[PDB]
């Protein structure tokens with residue numbers, strides 16, 4: 001009905017967050033210190049280290065545009 | 069091409085707040101055209117406007 | 132459809148409804164419009180027939196016979212449809228009195244009077 | 256039939272509120288400019304920079 | 313019979329919406345004016361003109 | 370997220386605390402599974418200090434990570450124009466069409482289409 005293959009849904013939850021920082025660096029090359037900081041707030045709120053009353057992650061993209 | 073830019077930058081009303089992120093990030097560029105007398109009282113008096121607008125002098129024909 | 136009227140057009144349709152009260156009528160038939168315009172001295176409908184070469188006496192007799200055979204009429208809704216087409220033909224925006232006159236030559240039950248009086252559709 | 260009668264009898268806001276200057280030049284309705292060769296070539300160089308990329312006449 | 317009714321329902325709009333001032337002056341029911349000989353006669357000398365024939369007090 | 374007043378700024382603050390907003394019809398949509406990302410434009414130490422003075426005091430500190438994108442490194446621009454042209458090659462592999470680009474055309478598509486303060 002949608003289009004995403006089945007192989008992208010049968011992956012384990014504990015294995016997708018480990019290789020998440022390596023998949024985003026395939027197309028976006030240049031921000032090696034910004035992509036790593038993205039998984040720092042997602043992997044912390046899913047392991048019980050963050051209060052459940054707060055959402056997933058809160059980001060604020062600043063600086064010049066055109067980077068990605 | 070913005071004819072007489074001193075009106076849109078703070079006369080109609082002040083519309084320079086919505087055009088600052090566009091001119092800085094390069095999303096929407098514009099070409100200014102005003103008088104040297106009005107260019108000092110609206111561009112040189114603001115540090116944020118001088119760093120983005122470059123002084124372009126127009127030569128006057130003679131004979 | 133946007134069928135706007137002018138100041139002069141409203142003075143004719145409103146007077147045609149009250150004109151049928153004296154002639155003993157209970158409906159607004161489109162044939163009563165041409166009768167009111169012919170009863171006014173120096174009107175717009177009379178000046179048009181003089182330039183196109185038409186006898187105003189024979190035309191008045193044609194619309195008078197239709198009124199006798201009569202007992203808002205549904206025929207009035209069809210007359211306003213053909214009159215709106217003449218508004219866009221003359222490169223105009225409003226609907227004056229001459230626009231309602233040109234619609235009389237489009238109806239099959241109203242174009243017979245114009246033929247016997249000497250009114251050509253191409254010349255009108 | 257009544258729908259097309261009431262109506263008759265991207266680039267939408269740019270053609271109604273603004274005037275496209277390239278349309279008059281591509282149709283021969285714009286007057287040419289001869290003598291400003293030292294200014295047109297400078298405006299192009301300003302737009303291809305980082306600091307002060309907005310020319311002001 | 314249907315024609316004499318609409319006629320009934322001189323002048324009609326002048327006797328149902330306006331008060332004739334000359335009617336009260338002819339029957340003596342209007343107070344005279346003493347002292348305005350230079351103002352009342354001035355209005356007469358204005359209505360007999362070609363331009364600006366509408367005096368405003 | 371900078372071209373607004375203080376009406377929408379105070380409404381988004383309760384989402385980062387309670388986790389749900391008050392709907393006008395009478396619902397409590399839990400925002401526990403909805404990530405909140407923003408985009409603005411207010412070396413990297415002096416950039417984040419500007420946005421802290423524009424918004425409220427009790428809002429810029431509750432942000433998880435203040436990721437500030439720096440300038441584009443010139444050594445990484447060449448690696449960007451190479452992975453984008455691969456998508457065009459994928460649409461021509463079914464028709465047996467080999468799209469080859471020399472080393473001269475790759476330099477023009479990098480120093481012109483990319484700029485630190487101009488945008489892609």
Ligand SMILES: Nc1ncnc2c1ncn2[C@@H]1O[C@H](COP(=O)(O)OP(=O)(O)O)[C@@H](O)[C@H]1O
Pocket residue numbers: 027028029065066067068408449453488489
């Ligand atoms: N690594 C990249 N390769 C190719 N194109 C890119 C890359 N990074 C960014 N872009 C392009 O730059 C553009 C940036 O758009 P952006 O300014 O984010 O739009 P908006 O201001 O509406 O969010 C995107 O449309 C994207 O196509």
